Write an enzyme that holds these catalytic residues in place. Sequence first.
Site, PDB file in Angstrom:
ATOM      1  N   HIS A  67      30.409  24.348  41.829  1.00 48.68           N
ATOM      2  CA  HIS A  67      31.394  23.748  42.752  1.00 48.68           C
ATOM      3  C   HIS A  67      32.613  23.336  42.150  1.00 48.68           C
ATOM      4  O   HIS A  67      32.931  21.996  41.966  1.00 48.68           O
ATOM      5  CB  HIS A  67      30.638  22.647  43.397  1.00 48.68           C
ATOM      6  CG  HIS A  67      29.845  22.970  44.737  1.00 48.68           C
ATOM      7  ND1 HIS A  67      28.456  23.201  44.568  1.00 48.68           N
ATOM      8  CD2 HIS A  67      29.908  23.703  45.989  1.00 48.68           C
ATOM      9  CE1 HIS A  67      27.810  23.582  45.547  1.00 48.68           C
ATOM     10  NE2 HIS A  67      28.769  23.706  46.392  1.00 48.68           N
ATOM     11  N   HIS A  71      35.433  28.515  42.153  1.00 56.30           N
ATOM     12  CA  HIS A  71      34.817  28.383  43.608  1.00 56.30           C
ATOM     13  C   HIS A  71      35.874  28.172  44.509  1.00 56.30           C
ATOM     14  O   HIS A  71      36.080  28.760  45.576  1.00 56.30           O
ATOM     15  CB  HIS A  71      33.657  27.434  43.625  1.00 56.30           C
ATOM     16  CG  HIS A  71      33.106  27.364  45.025  1.00 56.30           C
ATOM     17  ND1 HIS A  71      32.624  28.281  45.779  1.00 56.30           N
ATOM     18  CD2 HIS A  71      33.267  26.159  45.786  1.00 56.30           C
ATOM     19  CE1 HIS A  71      32.201  28.035  46.888  1.00 56.30           C
ATOM     20  NE2 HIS A  71      32.596  26.690  47.202  1.00 56.30           N
ATOM     21  N   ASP A 216      33.093  30.376  52.243  1.00 58.79           N
ATOM     22  CA  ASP A 216      32.110  29.377  51.161  1.00 58.79           C
ATOM     23  C   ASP A 216      31.142  30.157  50.807  1.00 58.79           C
ATOM     24  O   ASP A 216      30.856  29.960  49.665  1.00 58.79           O
ATOM     25  CB  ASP A 216      31.826  28.182  52.040  1.00 58.79           C
ATOM     26  CG  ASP A 216      31.549  26.877  51.016  1.00 58.79           C
ATOM     27  OD1 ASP A 216      31.710  27.016  49.967  1.00 58.79           O
ATOM     28  OD2 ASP A 216      30.551  26.054  51.697  1.00 58.79           O
ATOM     29  N   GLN A 268      16.443  34.217  47.694  1.00 54.18           N
ATOM     30  CA  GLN A 268      17.403  34.930  48.000  1.00 54.18           C
ATOM     31  C   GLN A 268      17.189  35.522  49.301  1.00 54.18           C
ATOM     32  O   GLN A 268      18.014  35.689  50.360  1.00 54.18           O
ATOM     33  CB  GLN A 268      17.915  35.786  46.954  1.00 54.18           C
ATOM     34  CG  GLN A 268      18.762  34.607  45.874  1.00 54.18           C
ATOM     35  CD  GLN A 268      19.744  33.896  46.358  1.00 54.18           C
ATOM     36  OE1 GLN A 268      20.905  34.646  46.484  1.00 54.18           O
ATOM     37  NE2 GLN A 268      19.934  32.712  46.074  1.00 54.18           N
TER      38      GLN A 268
HETATM   39  C1  LIG Z   1      27.104  26.146  51.455  1.00 47.70           C
HETATM   40  N1  LIG Z   1      26.231  24.669  50.729  1.00 47.70           N
HETATM   41  C2  LIG Z   1      24.789  25.109  50.544  1.00 47.70           C
HETATM   42  C3  LIG Z   1      24.286  25.370  49.171  1.00 47.70           C
HETATM   43  N2  LIG Z   1      24.750  26.514  48.729  1.00 47.70           N
HETATM   44  C4  LIG Z   1      25.894  26.613  47.723  1.00 47.70           C
HETATM   45  C5  LIG Z   1      24.060  27.600  49.301  1.00 47.70           C
HETATM   46  O1  LIG Z   1      23.045  27.582  49.993  1.00 47.70           O
HETATM   47  C6  LIG Z   1      24.363  29.011  48.613  1.00 47.70           C
HETATM   48  C7  LIG Z   1      25.752  29.566  48.471  1.00 47.70           C
HETATM   49  N3  LIG Z   1      25.796  30.978  48.261  1.00 47.70           N
HETATM   50  N4  LIG Z   1      24.488  30.895  48.161  1.00 47.70           N
HETATM   51  C8  LIG Z   1      24.158  32.313  47.514  1.00 47.70           C
HETATM   52  C9  LIG Z   1      23.552  29.935  48.235  1.00 47.70           C
HETATM   53  C10 LIG Z   1      22.197  30.142  47.847  1.00 47.70           C
HETATM   54  O2  LIG Z   1      21.754  30.749  47.089  1.00 47.70           O
HETATM   55  N5  LIG Z   1      21.254  29.299  48.664  1.00 47.70           N
HETATM   56  C11 LIG Z   1      19.935  29.379  48.822  1.00 47.70           C
HETATM   57  C12 LIG Z   1      19.404  28.777  49.960  1.00 47.70           C
HETATM   58  C13 LIG Z   1      18.260  28.781  49.999  1.00 47.70           C
HETATM   59  N6  LIG Z   1      17.127  29.231  49.024  1.00 47.70           N
HETATM   60  C14 LIG Z   1      15.894  28.797  48.914  1.00 47.70           C
HETATM   61  C15 LIG Z   1      15.714  29.312  47.642  1.00 47.70           C
HETATM   62  C16 LIG Z   1      14.207  29.398  46.917  1.00 47.70           C
HETATM   63  C17 LIG Z   1      14.353  29.452  45.383  1.00 47.70           C
HETATM   64  C18 LIG Z   1      13.214  29.512  44.792  1.00 47.70           C
HETATM   65  C19 LIG Z   1      12.052  29.129  45.466  1.00 47.70           C
HETATM   66  C20 LIG Z   1      12.071  28.932  46.722  1.00 47.70           C
HETATM   67  C21 LIG Z   1      13.001  29.094  47.451  1.00 47.70           C
HETATM   68  N7  LIG Z   1      16.980  29.465  47.042  1.00 47.70           N
HETATM   69  C22 LIG Z   1      17.688  29.530  47.721  1.00 47.70           C
HETATM   70  C23 LIG Z   1      19.166  29.635  47.853  1.00 47.70           C
HETATM   71 MG   LIG Z   2      31.304  22.089  49.950  1.00 44.79          MG
HETATM   72 ZN   LIG Z   3      32.266  25.222  48.606  1.00 39.94          ZN
END
Ligand SMILES: CNCCN(C)C(=O)c1cnn(C)c1C(=O)Nc1ccn2cc(-c3ccccc3)nc2c1
Ligand SMILES: [Mg+2]
Ligand SMILES: [Zn+2]
EC number: 3.1.4.17
Length: 316
Positions: A67, A71, A216, A268
């Site tokens: 962040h 970004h 985002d 993912q």
């Molecule tokens: C937008 N603000 C919200 C935060 N955020 C920046 C995001 O959610 C975001 C943005 N871009 N990407 C690519 C993501 C992302 O990767 N999200 C997730 C969402 C859910 N998950 C669950 C598990 C996981 C891992 C390990 C075990 C079990 C489960 N891993 C994830 C990852």
């Molecule tokens: Mg934000």
């Molecule tokens: Zn953001």
Amino acid sequence: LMQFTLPVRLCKEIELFHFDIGPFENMWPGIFVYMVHRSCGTSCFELEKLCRFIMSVKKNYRRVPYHNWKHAVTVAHCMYAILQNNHTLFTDLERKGLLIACLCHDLDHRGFSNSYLQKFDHPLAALYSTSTMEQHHFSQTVSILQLEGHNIFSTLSSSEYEQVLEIIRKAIIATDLALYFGNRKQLEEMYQTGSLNLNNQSHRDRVIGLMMTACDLCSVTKLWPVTKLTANDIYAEFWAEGDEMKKLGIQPIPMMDRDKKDEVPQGQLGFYNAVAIPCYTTLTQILPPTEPLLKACRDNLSQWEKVIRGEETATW
Ligand SMILES: CNCCN(C)C(=O)c1cnn(C)c1C(=O)Nc1ccn2cc(-c3ccccc3)nc2c1
Ligand SMILES: [Mg+2]
Ligand SMILES: [Zn+2]
């Protein structure tokens, strides 16, 4: 006039949805101005005030893994690509507001979720009960706009200035992913019943909200090597937050537990199916020229499936 110009490769590739802005931090302000000049116009902003504004915004992003200032400019570039491929659909004020909203949308982020601030009992959680960090990002945007020589909207009437600040406020609040689920569902129902109306301001707000989510989350719409490497930075933050949850005596959710790193590919896959694919699907329905974001997202979904099958190896 003094026009901003990019090297030949950047000039061509910045028009692609999957463009990566590169590792040279000192080029990002120039890339942003170039995008403002082309998407808005060379007369939208006084170059001196815009440059001073950009450098103050940069200074108020923190040295966190994801962040961060990179970004901010990455999210702005995705908005640039959406605006340039849908150039008849947006107003003069929306073009002035939306690249600025994207640059400012994570101002002063500490790499922690709204949930962590609540559990920690951070003062921000008392000030803003919902969309805690997002209300903070907007407050930080207003603070910077009110610095001497930073009023980039100084040629707008009082009523036009109020309108553009409302576009920016709603756009930044829309980056609270908690609000995305409801917003996309409303837009899906509106598109399928044929009730969606871009002359309706409340409808425009929802479409801009979805555009902000799309921008985002746009790491999932890059070429695989960019997508995979950005995921390392995202988890660096999640896992630091999980450590802080453990320090409060609270079990973190799986995505924030660094001991669960072997489950990241399945995590993912879950995130692409539940959030990313639906987001870019609904966006393509409303703005067909944004198709390349959905295509790239589907390509990365397939890459994560290959990782799960052991045909690809995702290392940190
Ligand atoms: C937008 N603000 C919200 C935060 N955020 C920046 C995001 O959610 C975001 C943005 N871009 N990407 C690519 C993501 C992302 O990767 N999200 C997730 C969402 C859910 N998950 C669950 C598990 C996981 C891992 C390990 C075990 C079990 C489960 N891993 C994830 C990852
Ligand atoms: Mg934000
Ligand atoms: Zn953001």
